[PDB]
């Protein structure tokens, strides 16, 4: 009926982590290659490459992520990076616009540019649908931060080797999220399952994106537009 102290340390260090690695001013967006309206590809690669760096910064501040082997950390990041970027982008996704909004009109990304960044509606139809789903949950930032850490800490990812230890961590995070909803979220009494439902949605979007990324990365005139981080993280090594 009440969160323990360690349960609320986990919450506190996770909210601090997110506040350090997400910037609501989006002022750093002016250092990317500008968007042109595959004319959107260079600005998207830059956007995603920057975001991957945030996710790594966030991951390093999750209690005990750092204590995994460097290999397990890489395996988790390589499989879960795109899911975490889809997750955190909810903070810039607007329901009135049905777009993401990270600046003036130039950092407003709409979906009609989908084919301009080398993707199809087969990815952006479910993604947008996911994004309004997640927005309707109207999450406290505690819950939003908790889902990213749980998403990152999935033992069922390709490459993981110590899927006991990281399942324990993921368990400790769900006990917090389960309890947070019970104690702190009014009308939070089926929100956990809905949230876990969103995790499985991600694995489906992940897949679609990984299939479409393969088509890009295999045409060198397109893969030359990506950054080295993107190529290493979404690569297959």
């Amino acid at each position: 009926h009440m969160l323990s102290d360690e349960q609320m340390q986990i919450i506190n260090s996770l909210v601090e982590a997110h506040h350090k690695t997400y910037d609501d001013s989006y002022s750093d967006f002016v250092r990317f290659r500008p968007p042109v309206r595959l004319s959107m590809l260079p600005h998207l690669a830059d956007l995603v490459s920057y975001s991957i760096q945030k996710v790594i910064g966030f991951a390093k501040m999750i209690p005990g992520f750092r204590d995994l082997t460097a290999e397990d950390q890489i395996a988790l990041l390589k499989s879960s990076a795109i899911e975490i970027i889809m997750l955190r982008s909810n903070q810039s996704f607007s329901l009135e616009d049905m777009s993401w909004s990270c600046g003036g009109p130039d950092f407003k990304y709409c979906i009609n540019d989908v084919t301009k960044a080398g993707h199809t509606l087969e990815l952006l139809e479910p993604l947008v649908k996911f994004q309004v789903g997640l927005k309707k949950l109207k999450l406290h930032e505690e819950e939003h931060v908790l889902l990213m850490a749980i998403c990152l800490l999935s033992p069922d990812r390709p490459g993981v080797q110590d899927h006991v230890r990281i399942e324990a961590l993921q368990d400790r995070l769900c006990d917090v999220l389960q309890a947070y909803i019970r104690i702190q979220h009014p009308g939070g009494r089926l929100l956990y399952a809905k949230m876990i439902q969103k995790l499985a949605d991600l694995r489906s979007l992940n897949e679609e994106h990984s299939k479409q990324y393969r088509s890009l990365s295999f045409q060198p005139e397109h893969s030359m537009q990506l950054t080295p981080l993107v190529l290493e993280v979404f690569g297959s090594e």
Binding site: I56, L77, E232, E237
Partner: peptide, 10 residues
């Protein structure tokens, strides 16, 4: 093999 990632993970 993941030169950048290792670097970023300190």
């Amino acid at each position: 093999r993941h030169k950048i990632l290792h670097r970023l993970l300190q």
